[PDB]
Design a protein around this ligand. Sequence first.
Ligand SMILES: O=C(O)CNC(=O)C(=O)O
Ligand SMILES: [Mg+2]
Ligand code: NI
Ligand SMILES: [Zn+2]
Length: 331
Amino acid sequence: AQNPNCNIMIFHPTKEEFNDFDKYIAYMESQGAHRAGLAKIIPPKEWKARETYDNISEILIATPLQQVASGRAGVFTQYHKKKKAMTVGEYRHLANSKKYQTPPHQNFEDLERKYWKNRIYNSPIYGADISGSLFDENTKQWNLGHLGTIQDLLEKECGVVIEGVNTPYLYFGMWKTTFAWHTEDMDLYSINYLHLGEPKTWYVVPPEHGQRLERLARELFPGSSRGCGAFLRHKVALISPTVLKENGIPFNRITQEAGEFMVTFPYGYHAGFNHGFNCAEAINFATPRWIDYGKMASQCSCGEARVTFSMDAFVRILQPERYDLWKRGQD
Ligand SMILES: O=C(O)CNC(=O)C(=O)O
Ligand SMILES: [Mg+2]
Ligand code: NI
Ligand SMILES: [Zn+2]
């Protein structure tokens, strides 16, 4: 078995190898990459996502989210308070202000220490989940707006034709902006490109050990667990590496820098934080190997997780027993 310790693997495809996206994902999996739940892909040196970022300040962040924490430094939840609209130029100036900017630090490790010590005492503002793309239309390789759709994968593998579309999302971050522990909708893959700015640190649990994280989460967030049988789908709970280590949960960490892709694999729980002002683009995708994960994915039916139009069909075809109850939650 390849990569039996479930380490995060880093790939350096050539420009030739960067032509066929599906084929490269399958290659990475042949090397055991998926066992970690997360992989890094450094694009060939000849590739670029677009020519410059010089003209992005006029993108609107219609609903910036203030991420307010509750709990203790290593075990907390976050709620998202909606703020007034602002442009990316306005958001970048806010990220760079004295109130919100990255503190002085020695290296990524010192910054990580500061994040886990001090995150709860601040409420950074995250411009998350903005439909759109920063890839130039002429970028033909690993253009996250030109990928094969999940609906088309489901049709190729299973013969069934369904409604729905699959488009990318932009994320504008600042120091301490946080993504809570989660797997993707329907335990899909994700791919995330860091277009510009400061790094993003990731934590990940191997898919084969995801239920150990779930059991710890039920213990640490016991009222949330009684409220919903899949409350991690709410995307609000944080658990630090120190707490994970104290509880014997297998995990890994890695820092993504501008110009790099990350892939999350089906049922790979992940969480993380931004080091400073940045912009990422991410989208869900599927392969043939995902289908069985999609059939087994948990679902939030308490009604809190409230997700996309296209998830309806996935549930309806892959999980027809749950259909009914899951749609009572979503309506
Ligand atoms: O970048 C972020 O805030 C969150 N991204 C992801 O969870 C992802 O790409 O799967
Ligand atoms: Mg603009
Ligand atoms: Ni994710
Ligand atoms: Zn729920």
